[PDB]
């Protein structure tokens, strides 16, 4: 299937409490592999997946040097934005940035991204053509003009279409056992009386990877988006994910309901029914 | 690997 590499950066000012807190994390698909925290003692980009620890000292020295430069740039950016928006120096503000690339099943470049948000709202983004900018307002227009004058997009495009994709391929290979695998959901159903005439059927999907999954309840015919509670997919904490869907049904009609599970790790969709 | 060049907004 397709794959992605994404880097997420967050810088938060804290006036009167020192320099802004900077956190960087990197992911390949739904797996985190690196982190940097400006408040930590190590002051190094650190591994968060076993397969990246195989990279040599030059790799780590390089990621650490580069991430420290990102930290200082976004620290300056907080100051610049406070100015562009004529804000006081007393409040805390947030700059977020994300960039990365997607590749298709053939591991060839599919799409690139590079965008920013200020206080949780879109600020500026490189458009899909990787040549033009989408600016949210006058402040962002100032940034856009600055970046056009210094030809930032052309250099970013080269990274997103080349370097980025090359790193993604490298990581997909070195971490092949963990990244190119699929963990099919382990499933089960529970039943609980919620009254003297109704019951709750809950369909579980546990320990699956990647996170993408579809859980649906059907009654004799199809889909039941009525009185069906579906929780947001959540991390189990061990690299896998979980999700459940529940339906409230008239007591005695359990037989009419089936839970359908779709996941890339399953050769064929699962159909589950309540079996006391 | 992250970008090797940085630039201010």
């Amino acid at each position, epitope marked *: 299937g397709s794959h992605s590499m994404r880097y997420f950066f967050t810088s938060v000012s804290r006036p009167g409490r020192g320099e802004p807190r900077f956190i960087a994390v990197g992911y390949v698909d739904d797996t985190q592999f690196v982190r940097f925290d400006s408040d930590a003692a190590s002051q190094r980009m650190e591994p968060r997946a076993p397969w990246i620890e195989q990279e040599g000292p030059e790799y780590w020295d390089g990621e650490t*040097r580069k991430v*420290k*430069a990102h930290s*200082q*740039t976004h*620290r*300056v950016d907080l100051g610049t934005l406070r100015g562009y928006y004529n804000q006081s120096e007393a409040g805390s503000h947030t700059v977020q940035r994300m960039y990365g690339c997607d590749v298709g099943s053939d591991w060839r470049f599919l799409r690139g991204y590079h965008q920013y948000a200020y206080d949780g709202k879109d600020y500026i983004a490189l458009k899909e053509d990787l040549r033009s900018w989408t600016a949210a307002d006058m402040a962002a227009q100032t940034t856009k003009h600055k970046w056009e*004058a*210094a*030809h*930032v997009a*052309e*250099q970013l*495009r*080269a*990274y997103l279409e080349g*370097t980025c994709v090359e790193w993604l391929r490298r990581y997909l290979e070195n971490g092949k056992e963990t990244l190119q695998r699929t963990d099919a959901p382990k499933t089960h159903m529970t039943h609980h009386a919620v009254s003297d005439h109704e019951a709750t059927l809950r369909c579980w999907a546990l320990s699956f990877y990647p996170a993408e999954i579809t859980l649906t309840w059907q009654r004799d015919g199809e889909d039941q988006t009525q009185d069906t509670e579906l929780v947001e997919t959540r991390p189990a904490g061990d690299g896998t994910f979980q999700k459940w869907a529940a339906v409230v049904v008239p007591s005695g009609q359990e037989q009419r309901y089936t839970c359908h599970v779709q996941h890339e790790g399953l050769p064929k969709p699962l159909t589950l029914r309540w079996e006391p | 690997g992250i970008l*090797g*060049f*940085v*630039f*201010t907004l």
Partner: T-cell receptor
Amino acid sequence: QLLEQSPQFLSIQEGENLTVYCNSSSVFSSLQWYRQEPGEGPVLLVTVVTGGEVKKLKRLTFQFGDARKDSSLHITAAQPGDTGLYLCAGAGSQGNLIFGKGTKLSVKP
Amino acid sequence: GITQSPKYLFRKEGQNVTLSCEQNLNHDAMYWYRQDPGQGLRLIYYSQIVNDFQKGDIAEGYSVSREKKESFPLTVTSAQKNPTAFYLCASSSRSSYEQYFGPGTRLTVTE
């Protein structure tokens, strides 16, 4: 990333035309040319960005290859004042400029 | 533009000296190079943004700091038997883009 400049040295008579080359196996997002006199700071002559672009500044003509892997500087009717070290440089992926080793031009009267 | 005062510097071997580089171009990135006679440029150290710096190709024996956007001081310590050279500072609006060079400083260190 590497940038190779040729020829290393060029000596020509005033009035002749000349061409110097800057070549690479890699693609550059932007490229610059400089002229430097001994013991002085290099002077920026031009920046090119678009593949295939041509920029003419007086008697100097600069071209950026379509693939953005090469550039050339051509001078028409060389004057003694053109004597100097010509350097090409390209955008570096680690936040610097990749410099060629230069072409030392001597224009004889 | 870029100022590198003074144009000429003379020091006795074993005496640390700091070369100044100041720019009023409002540039974020700064660079230091050394050049030997009849040769090209060799990158010593650079800084893409205030409060950060990184080594060039020949950083041994040198040190820099970037506490202010407008300045990038180069300290020449007991590098080695070769501190004598022409030193050039340059800046660019953002790192990797076109650089503007200072006039250079000629440093001679004698025994």
